[PDB]
Amino acid sequence: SLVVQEQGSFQHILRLLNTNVDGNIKIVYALTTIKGVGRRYSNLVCKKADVDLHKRAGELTQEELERIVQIMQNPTHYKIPAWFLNRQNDITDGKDYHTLANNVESKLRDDLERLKKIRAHRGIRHFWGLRVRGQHTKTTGRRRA
Amino acid sequence: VLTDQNPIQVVVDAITNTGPREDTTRVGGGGAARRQAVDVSPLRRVNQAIALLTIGAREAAFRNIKTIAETLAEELINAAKGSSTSYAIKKKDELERVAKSNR
């Protein structure tokens, strides 16, 4: 029932983490556009940054969004339970990270080339392009590429 | 709220408006299957009216913001008036035209 006439400060797009985050949709589902940021992570970040999750993304302040990306790129510093993290207990650094927009692809390629250079079975499977999780490949995934 | 008479009066005169009076059947004839125009029983008139109305409401409410209730409402209203924009009315005149051609 609470209507408010918005002003000209709305922006139909906004730019976060080298990704063209769409405006005109609610902020948590808009932040899911960032690759590496899903619904749970985006919802918890919008909660920890103390933004109104009912607000649209295109009408949000610069300080609110930079607080959001700070909480994103430094997750555990703001009381994040460290099992939400998609890259936890990594193989070299040993500490829990959370990869983001292009670091997800780069780190995926890093573990793939690690497996390929140690000639592990999953690495050879990925190099051939076959299924690696032990699925049957006789009938499904015919036009997988 | 629209058409402030009895809404059940609207649905009964809708099914009388969209009841198909004559319809065609599929006879063999030899090789080429033919159409033959026969008349429709009143029970099948009611049944075909109900099926046409709800099918039109369903396919018009599919994949859009208009709910099935209000879609069925406007379909029933247009059928009760007689409008040629109702799905059931269009199907009715098509079936009666094919019957009249294959008399």
Partner: protein, 82 residues
């Protein structure tokens, strides 16, 4: 990969998500003369979102411009108050 279908494109509508003064006083002036008012009616006649339609419905029935007939979820039925 054969399809056996057409899959023709559509209009890709651009319903409004935030309101301004012109849309606000537009709805304030033309939600009367609507005999039957609902979320989809507002969406089709004003090109606004469903969220704006719901909030505007609650607003107008709170002040009293539209009368509720049935306020069920997923289907709200409002008339004009005369």
């Amino acid at each position: 990969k054969k399809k056996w279908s057409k899959k023709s494109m559509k209009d890709r509508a651009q319903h409004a998500v935030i309101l301004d003064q012109e849309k606000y006083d537009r709805i304030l002036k033309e939600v009367p003369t609507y005999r039957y008012v609902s979320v989809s009616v507002l969406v089709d006649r004003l090109k606004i979102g469903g969220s704006l339609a719901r909030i505007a419905l609650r607003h107008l029935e709170k002040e009293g411009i539209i009368k509720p007939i049935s306020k069920h979820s997923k289907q709200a039925i409002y008339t004009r108050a005369t």
